[PDB]
Chains A and B, each alone.
Chain A
């Protein structure tokens, strides 16, 4: 008999687009994330100057947005419809989370805009459990325990039971 407080849910879906160039490309990738979600994303800037790729310190490189709830469930349903409900062994992390990246956002269902263009985006699913709000809150901080963690085997069987997704080694 499985305890209903151990229902493995999804905490968040992390979207990011890393174009590597500030300005027009970056703001059109922000428009891509805004048309995907329905909310404004936040630009992520650099940590230090790398002269190999053409970036400088405190220069806006990427853009990202975290999505919660049924909207994150629906965008992840779109993403698995794109990637035909299959993932690899190495895509799964040992901490219990996973993620993957699509080639371009036109597969999600978004109509092409000739002003905006083509931008790919990267999914990262942070899985969840009722009782993960202890470590990040202010009142009573603490670790969540060994039984309460999500393992890689438990993530694989959750994915296979939920989305009927085949998992192939590689």
Chain B
């Protein structure tokens, strides 16, 4: 036989890590550099723009750290896009751009900067930064929070970053992780970035599947056929989506119905119930031994 590694001494010496580290959500080495403020700033809120790309959603929030918990000053979800004219395609690069633009315009509407700092309306994809206007309230600045997503070239986190920058958030960024930047010859192509923002990669793959075979076409894109999405409709649909986002960025919450107040969960067993259970198990074992013998 061999020695058991996980012994009582192992559980006595075992230190647990943090809860978000055990869940695998927070990179605390990155959070140590991100979230803390310099001590000579004296409770100046340090804003980070958090992007989390889920399987079916793109969460874009803006947070500043407090000691009880970092409060979300503004949030934007990808399922709000059917209100703006994007029925389907909620987890791609164009929806990341629209969610970042929606977060930016909603934050400027809540701060009262709708007319000032318009941003990019005729978006091409060039290197753009929000310059502060003199004699006006200053531009909002924040710093990007990707999290545990590996930041390679062509990431939806950087698509949401480009959406926030074009909506008018002064975020420092380089044109290296945006799609279009060639890794070999090292120059940035803005036309390829415009195609990825407006979604012509999805349209080209749609046309490629339509040329190849209808079965793999219907296997890959089903709700695009259900909601009548064609490649010629794609760029105009995202233009109307950008126009609707820049037109009405405010959010109305859903009305809450009175709760029926029932418990789907199974409640916790009490001490008297546990003491009764062990007594019934012992009595059942004794009467089974008496019945067998």
Contact = CB atoms under 8 A, between A and B. Distances in A.
Task: Tell me, yes or no, whether A and B come into direct contact in the complex with CB atoms closer than 8 A.
Answer: yes
B283 interface: no
Contacts of B150: 138
B251 to A, nearest CB: 28
Nearest to B53: A139
Nearest to A139: B148
Interface in A112-163: 138-142
Interface string B17-57: 00000011100000000000000000000000000000000
A126 to B, nearest CB: 23
Nearest to A137: B24
B18 to A, nearest CB: 14
Interface residues of B, number: 5
A140 B20 CA distance: 11
A138 B27 CA distance: 11
A137 to B, nearest CB: 9
Interface string A72-87: 0000000000000000
Nearest to A138: B148
Contacts of B148: 138-139
* B-side interface mostly: loop
Nearest to A141: B24
Contacts of A142: 24
Nearest to B23: A140
Contacts of B24: 139-142
Contacts of A139: 24, 148
B1 to A, nearest CB: 15
Contacts of B23: 140
A138 B152 CA distance: 15
Contacts of A140: 23-25
A141 B148 CA distance: 12
Nearest to B148: A138
Residue picked from A139, A140, A141, most chain B C-beta under 10 Å: A139
B265 to A, nearest CB: 21
A98 B68 CA distance: 52
A140 B147 CA distance: 13
A21 to B, nearest CB: 35
A142 B23 CA distance: 8
A142 B24 CA distance: 8
Nearest to B24: A141
A130 to B, nearest CB: 15
Interface string B118-153: 000000000000000000000000000000101000
A85 B150 CA distance: 44
Contacts of B25: 140
A142 B150 CA distance: 19
A156 to B, nearest CB: 24
A138 B23 CA distance: 11
9 contacts: A138-B148, A138-B150, A139-B24, A139-B148, A140-B23, A140-B24, A140-B25, A141-B24, A142-B24
List 3 tightest A-B contacts by C-beta distance, closest first. A141-B24, A140-B24, A138-B148
Interface of B: 23-25, 148, 150
Given A139-B148, A140-B23, A141-B24, 6 more contacts: A138-B148, A138-B150, A139-B24, A140-B24, A140-B25, A142-B24
